[PDB]
Symmetry: C2
Subunit: 237 residues, 2 copies
Amino acid sequence: ERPSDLVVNRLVLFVVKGTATSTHNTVKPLILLEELGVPHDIYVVEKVSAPWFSEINPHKMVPAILDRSPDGRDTLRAWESTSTLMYIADAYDKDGTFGGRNVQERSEINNWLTLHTAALGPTARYWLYFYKLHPEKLPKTIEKLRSNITVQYDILERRLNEPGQQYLALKDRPTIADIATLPFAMKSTAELFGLEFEKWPKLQEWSVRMGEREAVKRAWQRVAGFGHGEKEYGMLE
Amino acid sequence: SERPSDLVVNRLVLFVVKGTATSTHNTVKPLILLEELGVPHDIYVVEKVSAPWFSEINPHKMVPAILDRSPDGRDTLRAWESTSTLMYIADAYDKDGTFGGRNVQERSEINNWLTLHTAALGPTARYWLYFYKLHPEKLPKTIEKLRSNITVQYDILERRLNEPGQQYLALKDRPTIADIATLPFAMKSTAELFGLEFEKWPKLQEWSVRMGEREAVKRAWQRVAGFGHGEKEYGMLEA
């Protein structure tokens, strides 16, 4: 049931129409693609409920990836934003600049990547659901989720207060752990949650340091635009 | 913070708590992989996860956690979050990628199904359990929505295991860290806790039995239940 314009000649990143609250997961793989200069296409999904899309991601959410296998004879897929970061690092980051160069680096990268994937990420996702999408309003649930966000900010703040710890996983450079965390740990997102981001100064300084990277600027610029160009849905450009 | 005198890192040390019906569903995950690969390891039964010395290992103040020697033996490494403990054991000890994946194609699907548990199943189960038992007030509308999300997640796993020759979640041929991560939240006992009839997902049930029949899985479940009930209640157990 695949749309006619869906072809996989290179990495295809699946996104939706760009809004303030539709881009915080899709921007993650886009940042890493921009950091590594990976050739890729953008596919704007009209309906994530469409049967053809569930064959790619059974969880029926963006981001998702279709790409050629290393030998180029088969197609493979990545879904869940953390999984898209793990795939891009595996396939395209051969020097381990963002994925980690050894067991030691990867131990810490996986600690802070998994902490985001298991705690802040899902908590932020449930907060957004109950705050906007759920038919009924449940303030007690929304407040508890907001409370849990501040606990995760406290953990990140502690880490970034350790001597010479410029980034979450490694002291020297940002990794897929930092890319996964940034969209749910920046001033704009903090303000959406109704939090004063200045209460976590080292986390705020970290979010600014990440935001000054050219690949991060390019990612935020592009993700906002998807679906608002001459072509509303389907394969862009 | 000073570590307890009996905490030394001569090999992989897995941090657990005293074995109970409600304390083992995460700690069993790394233990299953350690048993599958025959990795040499010690067991440390943590009395108080609130202890400052333990927060220096895992800032999230939960088990499982790991301390281990670096490959070269110069440094001490750490792994925390159960999914991260599986990643670390696979990286350090699974040289043939028997559970970690042998190529980019295998690892793509392993990381999909692993992360589905880490990001969706695990947090949904944790929030259900929190609102059902731990939260001072009962919020049945929240609990019912989380229970609903569990059935959708069971539907996804069932769909995958209905695909021709798909015997395991990630790979057709063998179980991986994806299967190990998922098993405790997709088995009959857990389904009954959620108030669900597990027979509604027959291929998922068949998969849970297939995983449960593995010798390493049997050994893991026995050992996690026993920790802290031997000759030593807390601290480094004597293998």
